[PDB]
Structures are given as C-alpha cells and as structure tokens.
Amino acid sequence: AVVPSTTEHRGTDIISLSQAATKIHQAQQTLQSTPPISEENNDERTLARQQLTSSLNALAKSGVSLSAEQNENLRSAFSAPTSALFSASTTISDAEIWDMVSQNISAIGDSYLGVYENVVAVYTDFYQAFSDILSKMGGWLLPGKDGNTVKLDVTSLKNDLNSLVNKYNQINSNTVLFPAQSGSGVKVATEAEARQWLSELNLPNSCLKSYGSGYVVTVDLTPLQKMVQDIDGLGAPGKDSKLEMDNAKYQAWQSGFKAQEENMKTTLQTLTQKYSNANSLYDNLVKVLSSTISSSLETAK
C-alpha cells in the first residue's frame, strides 16, 4: 500500500475499534443511568458489561496495533488488581494487553461491582418493604381512650414485621446479598469469601449463614427482630384489639423502635455509598478504555 492513508490500522481493525467505542459508551451510559434497584435493571447492567467485554476480546483477537504510551497507559490502569474481593490494586505485547484489560475489567465488573449491584438491589427491596409497613403506623396508633395513654395495634404491627423478617429469613435469590443468586439452586461461597465481603460491606456476623457446602451473606435481620422482641415486650394486647399503655411506656418503646429503624437506615447508607464508589471505580476504568481507543483512532498519517 503506497497510497496515503489516515491510520496504520486496518479497515477490519477500524471496524473493531469503532464497535468497541460504541459498546464502551453504551455500557458507560447504561451503567450511569440504570440504577441497581431491580433484578431486570441488574441484568441490563450485566449485559452492557458483557458486550463491552466481547468488544474487547474482538480487539485482542483482531490483534489491533497500539502505541507505546497507549500500551503503558492501558497496562498501568488495569494490571495487578482484584485481590481478596477487596479493592487491592516487562515488554508486554499488544495482543497480550487487550487480553489483560478484557480479563481484569471483567473480574471487577463481576466479582466486585456485580456484587454491590446485587447487594443494593436486595437491600433496597428489603428496606422498601420495611418502609411500607412503617406507613401503616397511621391507623395503628391512636391516643389513649382517656387522657394520657396510647393504643398500639401491636398485633398487626407485629404480624407485618414478622412476615418481613420471615421472608428475608429464607435463603433464596431474593434474600442473599452474596454471592449473587444466578439460576435455580442456591449459590454458596467459601467462608473466607463470605467473611471477606462481610467486612467489605461492614456487616455483622449475623448476616453470615451457612448453606450446605458453603456460606452466604444475607441482609441484617437483627433490627427488625429486636423490634418484634420489644413489641412482644409491651405485654400481650387487650382481648383482640389494641394494647393500651401509658406515656412513659409508649415513649420508651417508640424511641427504641426508632433506634432500630435508624440502624437499618445506617446499614443501607453504607451499602449504597460503597456501591457508589464501586460503580465509580469501574467507570474510571471505562474512561481509560475510551481514552485509549480514542487515541488509537487519531489521524496517524
């Protein structure tokens, strides 16, 4: 080829670089606009990453050239990471580096981000449910028949709470934070792994539960369960109606009920913030990617 061109890349190379940029961006847009709040949503995030992965393999497979800086840039940002499902972290060829990028980014997208997504999706759904019960408090609290007393429909409150605790007490694909429950038939992890993610999510050991050959991490039911305990503690209700109690008794019970609600709120917040940092971390990798692919298309003629 003695005719002037705009790039040392091949037409077949350019097609790959192009599709990669497409996937990279569609991925980045998907991951930034679709929150991990529903199972369907997570499927789309997961998909966007898989397609971004494929695009990368195509690049590596195609053996698409790469300048020195591009190689070192890509290398640096992607090499030597993913240790302990924590965040921890020569002349390497071009085909070799795409494979690395394709390998590592996928690990992060799955073993890390993917977990956080699933965590926020489960914890979200879980707190939502608790919120809904909480909105029924209206028709469950009425001032005392005479003067200073208050009637609490302890029974209905307790029933609801219990159903909630009962639902998430099971071990299925709607109550497991880690590992993510893909498919039919419970997915367990080793205890070391279970405990790693337990630390990562700053969750109590109670969230750790065994299932056959392995372990899984669930939501934290301690708060809800203390709530039920206290309700049981107010003493058996009236005949079949509500339980009456004076102010002191009621005041103390309520503050406690708020303390427990407050607890879930704090767990949840730590989870979403941590999810955020994960998602961000992944995005920065996707930026480096788009940045390298962009530099690779620059008119080098």
Author numbering: 32 to 120, 127 to 338
What does the paper say about this structure?
Bacterial infections including Salmonellosis and Shigellosis affect millions of people every year. These bacteria use a T3SS to secrete virulence factors to manipulate host cells. The T3SS is a multi-component system that forms a continuous protein transport channel through the two bacterial membranes and the periplasmatic space that extends into the surrounding medium by a needle structure. Tip proteins, which bind to the distal end of the T3SS needle, are thought to play an important role in this process. SipD from S. typhimurium, IpaD from Shigella flexneri and BipD from Burkholderia mallei are tip proteins that are thought to interact with their corresponding needle subunits PrgI, MxiH and BsaL, respectively, to make the needle tip complex.
We solved the X-ray crystal structure of SipD, the needle tip protein of S. typhimurium at 3.0 Å resolution. The crystal contained 4 copies of SipD in the asymmetric unit with structural information for 306 of 343 amino acids. Here we report structural features of SipD chain A, which, compared with chains B to D, showed continuous electron density for most amino acids. SipD is predominantly α-helical folded and can be divided in three structurally different domains. The central domain, domain 2, (green in Figure 1) adopted a coiled coil structure with two helices of 47 and 52 amino acids length, respectively. The bending of the coiled coil of domain 2 allowed us to distinguish between a concave and a convex surface. Domain 2 is joined to domain 3, an α/β-structure (yellow in Figure 1). Domain 3 is in contact with the convex surface provided by the coiled coil of the central domain. Domain 2 and 3 of SipD share high sequence homology and similar three dimensional structure to the orthologs from S. flexneri (r.m.s. deviation 1.3 Å with IpaD) or B. mallei (r.m.s. deviation 2.2 Å with BipD). Notably, amino acids involved in intramolecular contacts are identical or highly conserved in all three orthologs, suggesting functional relevance in T3SS tip proteins.
